[PDB]
Structure 1
Amino acid sequence: APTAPSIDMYGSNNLQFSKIELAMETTSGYNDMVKYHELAKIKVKFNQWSGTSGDTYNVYFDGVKVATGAITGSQTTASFEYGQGGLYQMEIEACDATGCSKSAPVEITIADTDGSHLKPLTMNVDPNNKSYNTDPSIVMGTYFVEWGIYGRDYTVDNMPVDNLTHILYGFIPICGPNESVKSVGGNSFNALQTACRGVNDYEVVIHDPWAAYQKSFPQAGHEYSTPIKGNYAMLMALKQRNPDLKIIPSIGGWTLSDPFYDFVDKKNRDTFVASVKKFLKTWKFYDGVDIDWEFPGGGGAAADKGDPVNDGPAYIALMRELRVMLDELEAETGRTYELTSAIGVGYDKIEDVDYADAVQYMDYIFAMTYDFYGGWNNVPGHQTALYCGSFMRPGQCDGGGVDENGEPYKGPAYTADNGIQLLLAQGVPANKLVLGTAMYGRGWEGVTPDTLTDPNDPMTGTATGKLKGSTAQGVWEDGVIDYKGIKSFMLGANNTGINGFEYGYDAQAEAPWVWNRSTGELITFDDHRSVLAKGNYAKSLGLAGLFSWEIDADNGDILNAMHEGMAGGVVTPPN
């Protein structure tokens, strides 16, 4: 028989192959950093220094023949292509008329972006997240943010994945007009300019490739030379752990919506929709797309954008077009892909889209039932309440009243039920609506007791400015605090108030607050009681389930309450 191939490990890239090439020590244009191949090019060098070399080689993976070719003397390079990622025991055999001889087996890795080469992720979840057996039909969603790995120090293996059905990954930008991103300060706008160098406008990119795929996480067993790293390799390894988990990129958001206003021109939608198909072929762990345009008709971060007449028809077309695209991917892959969107729920946002037409294309609508009130002005109110609070005036709830100056309210007040009912009344199915819960508070200072028109209700006061605090307190920007900061700095363990805050609850709105009467610090948020009330409301109306913004800011209490409030419930999944 021929001499047995001896595999040259260092001559064959120590048997590490990747279907994706990712730039690792530089930051450039997305199309210069990211190259994906349908088949990996496998090249394995071997030698046969003694004896006869033979005529032909065969490559085996786990005992099955995957490639064959000619022997070239004493040194041969086996070159072939292979589509399926994984870890395999490879053997190379040499054959001639006399017989065949084979190398010892050695493990080959073929990386792919479904995580098929990876073991299930090792988790490191705060043990305050409890276990439940919520019915699998119910959505339990949340947003994980790409930048949460910096100061917030919250990584993929921290998520309580067994308690989630959907992870929306916040956020994928669209190249093009993006002045709103300058409002975050720091390097975010300039990072986007780098990502978009050499990329056509209206195509998606990764905003932060360091966080997405370059940074080595030692808890995920990453090495500097590991071919895929960052949050994306962790999400791949999470999907190996929990294969029924849906991981969906979220396009847009508050700061990254400015390009959507140009989707009134179909040409820009076509560019966008093709890029999203490419994106999902590249990054196979994703299961669909979520569109967070804030908002058709305007009222988002860009004060100079928004077309009430045209943006709704654009949104609907987008959804129509994205669904055609996703149907192509389902044909190509055999997989099921979801199309969703987070939407505003004020009456003036919902009136700009004919959702009866859009929703036919969509699996879920994540109703943004939060940010109703906040530190952008000095008017207290409940930011995430189901119903109208005590603080509201006669006829403010349904919009038929007049304000304190005698001016007509222009529509119903901002509450979760006013927006859910406006969506239902136009024919959006209940079982496609997902109700939002807040893992953060918004707040004010200067709401001192002398400013209240009703002394029992700090939501009848007036502020002097936004809540201020430090990042250790969960205050990453003025007027906004993580729920785990409210719990550590205002509620305490027994939920009865610390540091001069008192707890209160508006039983008519279903909305909690904490109030320090000395500093006039007032914070509106969601707590155990209000999130049980959202679960009971969702069960009562047959909504699809609950989602939350943002998972790093919880300590387990809010996600636990989402599940508790859903106990016993089942729902019909949309077809």
Structure 2
Amino acid sequence: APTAPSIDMYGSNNLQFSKIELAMETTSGYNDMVKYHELAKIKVKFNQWSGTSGDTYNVYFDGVKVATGAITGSQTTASFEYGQGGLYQMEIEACDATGCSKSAPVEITIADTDGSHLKPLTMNVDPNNKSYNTDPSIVMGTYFVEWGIYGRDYTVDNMPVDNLTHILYGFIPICGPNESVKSVGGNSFNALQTACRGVNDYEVVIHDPWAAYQKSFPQAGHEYSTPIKGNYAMLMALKQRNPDLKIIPSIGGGTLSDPFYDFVDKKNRDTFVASVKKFLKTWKFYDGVDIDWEFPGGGGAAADKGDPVNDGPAYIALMRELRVMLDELEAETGRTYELTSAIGVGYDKIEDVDYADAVQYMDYIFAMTYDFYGGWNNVPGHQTALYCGSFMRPGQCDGGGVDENGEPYKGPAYTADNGIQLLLAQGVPANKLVLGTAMYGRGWEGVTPDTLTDPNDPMTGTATGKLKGSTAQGVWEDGVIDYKGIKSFMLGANNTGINGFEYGYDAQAEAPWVWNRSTGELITFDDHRSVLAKGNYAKSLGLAGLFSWEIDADNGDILNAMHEGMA
């Protein structure tokens, strides 16, 4: 006999509710912006405009009763709490002593960060990415960078997810000392200062909440009331489409590694470890953690930092304490959590960590088998070669000899193979090692013929400085160029060379280059041929697979070649 309630859809936040509460119109400290709740707070306004209102209401989701309260007027606000994310058919019933009247059913959304309230993501992948039937046991990883969504214009739905087992999401910073972030310029340190207000030193934070959970993406169907937007909501819809895809946050990275050096203090580690646990409880679509400490012992962005006695033991203690915390998350949730880590592979980086000790705690080690040479100095080299190139001096490859002063080589030359070998010799199992491919080149200006010691090898010349170019040609910073930029603007469709560039390949190193004799522009990179050699090298040794850095810079060719070389 009471009038059936009508739901005030707009008075009820359009029936979009959430276990996670996120600031949408603000940029502030992480703890101010992100609050995870065990139970979602649901607030539903309903009206009874004509007839009698009755005295009590009940709320049903999919026929189960989940709340009751008093009706006292022609307008009621039902507030209550609910613990499971998902879409539900909601009915509200108004009751009196003579009977009850149900509202017609209406869909209520309760978001959770596993994406249970979302449809599978809709893909928009360059069709230049082919299909493969690569053994599901082989690792095919890549990094997807948070800021890729700006100028580079590359979003989660552009990733060829069917050709990937692991997405590493770069990068999650740590609060605390971060001078190295400052040195980068832009808003980057400022944004980190903001994110860290009200947050303890050594805890993880989201760097760019706009890219991560605020930015509305039409292709994902985000609209004003959607409680989770940005890269994270798309990666949640992505997990719905490909539930076996591992998505892993990458913590640290080149410029974000300054706080790792205070991990020689166990309090700092405990703080960090506990913030990582909270982070994974907050963002349930993530499947583990990746530590990119560049680098234990030093030799990274922070010139004033690095302890070669203590950093290694701290790294190993860190991996153990992470795996302990991850064991508890597996306990509480029933899921498998992965612990991985990207590492430098120069002899001088390797010798500072007992990796055989650390790896027992870990699922994989992403060997950063790139950046061997680059625009930081005027010495050309293959940045991502497998083997020693022709340009190397006698005894340089193994570090047995002397340079042009007659100064002794301190250790084996920087090559992929030399790195993998050093890790195998320490006792790291082959099947935990993932070998890295570059989706970009590094480059130089001013390596003209008059500089060569061998007239057919520009790797024997001398540079004037870093390669300069525009973002239109894929140069996002000095000395670095996207692979798709090399292909469009230097190689051309036939891989023969265009705009003054020639294509060369060092068969001994397994490394391509492009060279413009007159500007002396020289770019070292990975192409189809050398990725095939890497896949072959990986098969040969029983390596876990391949990964790449970074996915937005590929046109399809590098990832394709990754799958082909593993076949």
Report the TM-score range of the alignment, normalised by the length of the smaller protein: over 0.9
Counterpart CA distance in 1 for 2:66 and 2:510 is 62
Contiguous gaps of at least 5 residues in structure 2 = none
**Residue 70 of structure 1: how far off its partner (Å):** 4.5
Counterpart CA distance in 1 for 2:534 and 2:204 is 34
Counterpart CA distance in 2 for 1:402 and 1:98 is 99
**Residue 240 of structure 1: how far off its partner (Å):** 1.4
Counterpart CA distance in 1 for 2:424 and 2:36 is 43
Counterpart CA distance in 2 for 1:94 and 1:44 is 14
Q: Is the 8 A contact 2:291 2:342 kept in 1?
A: yes
Counterpart CA distance in 1 for 2:62 and 2:449 is 74
**Residue 117 of structure 1: how far off its partner (Å):** 1.4
More displaced, 412-421 or 453-462? 453-462
**Residue 555 of structure 1: how far off its partner (Å):** 0.5
**Residue 219 of structure 1: how far off its partner (Å):** 1.6
Q: Is the 8 A contact 2:14 2:225 kept in 1?
A: no
**Residue 4 of structure 1: how far off its partner (Å):** 2.4
SS in 1 for 2:183: helix
| Per-residue CA distance 1:28-47 (angstroms, 9 max, x = gap) | 11111111111101122334
**Residue 406 of structure 1: how far off its partner (Å):** 1.0
**Residue 520 of structure 1: how far off its partner (Å):** 1.2
**Residue 286 of structure 1: how far off its partner (Å):** 1.0
TM-score (norm 1): 0.96
**Residue 126 of structure 1: how far off its partner (Å):** 0.9
Compared CA separation, residues 547 and 451, structure 1 to 2 (3 A): same
SS in 2 for 1:260: helix
Counterpart CA distance in 1 for 2:424 and 2:332 is 35
Compared CA separation, residues 477 and 10, structure 1 to 2 (3 A): closer
Counterpart CA distance in 2 for 1:558 and 1:279 is 32
**Residue 99 of structure 1: how far off its partner (Å):** 4.2
Structure 1 position 70 matched with structure 2 position 70: yes
**Residue 3 of structure 1: how far off its partner (Å):** 3.5
Counterpart CA distance in 2 for 1:212 and 1:77 is 32
**Residue 224 of structure 1: how far off its partner (Å):** 3.1
Structure 1 position 244 matched with structure 2 position 244: yes
Q: Is the 8 A contact 2:365 2:434 kept in 1?
A: yes
More displaced, 457-466 or 308-317? 457-466
Q: Is the 8 A contact 2:254 2:301 kept in 1?
A: yes
Counterpart CA distance in 2 for 1:69 and 1:428 is 62
**Residue 287 of structure 1: how far off its partner (Å):** 0.9
**Residue 486 of structure 1: how far off its partner (Å):** 0.5
SS in 1 for 2:394: coil
Counterpart CA distance in 1 for 2:303 and 2:541 is 35
SS in 2 for 1:481: strand
| Per-residue CA distance 1:477-499 (angstroms, 9 max, x = gap) | 11111101110111001111111
Counterpart CA distance in 2 for 1:445 and 1:31 is 46
Counterpart CA distance in 1 for 2:174 and 2:6 is 49
Compared CA separation, residues 90 and 396, structure 1 to 2 (3 A): same
Counterpart CA distance in 2 for 1:45 and 1:188 is 42
Counterpart CA distance in 1 for 2:180 and 2:14 is 46
Compared CA separation, residues 10 and 450, structure 1 to 2 (3 A): closer
**Number of residue equivalences:** 567
Counterpart CA distance in 1 for 2:17 and 2:162 is 31
**Residue 150 of structure 1: how far off its partner (Å):** 1.2
**Residue 20 of structure 1: how far off its partner (Å):** 1.5
Counterpart CA distance in 2 for 1:46 and 1:210 is 33
| Per-residue CA distance 1:289-311 (angstroms, 9 max, x = gap) | 10000000000001000000000
Counterpart CA distance in 2 for 1:385 and 1:544 is 19
**Residue 50 of structure 1: how far off its partner (Å):** 4.9
**Residue 59 of structure 1: how far off its partner (Å):** 2.1
Alignment-derived partner of residue 314 in structure 1:
314
SS in 2 for 1:412: coil
Q: Is the 8 A contact 2:16 2:225 kept in 1?
A: no
**Residue 225 of structure 1: how far off its partner (Å):** 3.2
SS in 1 for 2:496: coil
**Residue 74 of structure 1: how far off its partner (Å):** 4.7
Q: Is the 8 A contact 2:316 2:357 kept in 1?
A: yes
**Residue 454 of structure 1: how far off its partner (Å):** 1.6
**Residue 543 of structure 1: how far off its partner (Å):** 0.8
Counterpart CA distance in 2 for 1:495 and 1:52 is 79
Counterpart CA distance in 1 for 2:406 and 2:521 is 29
Pairing of 1:118-517 with structure 2 (within 5 A): 118-517=118-517
Counterpart CA distance in 2 for 1:169 and 1:182 is 22
Alignment-derived partner of residue 91 in structure 1:
91
SS in 2 for 1:184: coil
| Per-residue CA distance 1:369-390 (angstroms, 9 max, x = gap) | 0000111111111110111111
Counterpart CA distance in 1 for 2:465 and 2:240 is 47
| Per-residue CA distance 1:426-461 (angstroms, 9 max, x = gap) | 111111111000000001111111211122211111
**Residue 466 of structure 1: how far off its partner (Å):** 1.1
Counterpart CA distance in 2 for 1:76 and 1:471 is 56
Alignment root-mean-square deviation, CA: 1.5
**Residue 27 of structure 1: how far off its partner (Å):** 1.1
Counterpart CA distance in 1 for 2:233 and 2:108 is 18
Compared CA separation, residues 47 and 471, structure 1 to 2 (3 A): closer
**Residue 315 of structure 1: how far off its partner (Å):** 0.3
**Residue 55 of structure 1: how far off its partner (Å):** 5.4
SS in 1 for 2:44: strand
Alignment-derived partner of residue 109 in structure 1:
109
SS in 2 for 1:512: strand
**Residue 90 of structure 1: how far off its partner (Å):** 0.8
Counterpart CA distance in 1 for 2:494 and 2:10 is 60
SS in 1 for 2:129: coil
| Per-residue CA distance 1:466-516 (angstroms, 9 max, x = gap) | 111111111111111110111011100111111111111111111111111
Counterpart CA distance in 2 for 1:220 and 1:364 is 32
| Per-residue CA distance 1:213-232 (angstroms, 9 max, x = gap) | 11111221222332211111
More displaced, 459-468 or 433-442? 459-468
Counterpart CA distance in 2 for 1:377 and 1:241 is 45
SS in 2 for 1:540: helix
SS in 1 for 2:484: helix
**Residue 278 of structure 1: how far off its partner (Å):** 0.9
Counterpart CA distance in 1 for 2:65 and 2:386 is 61
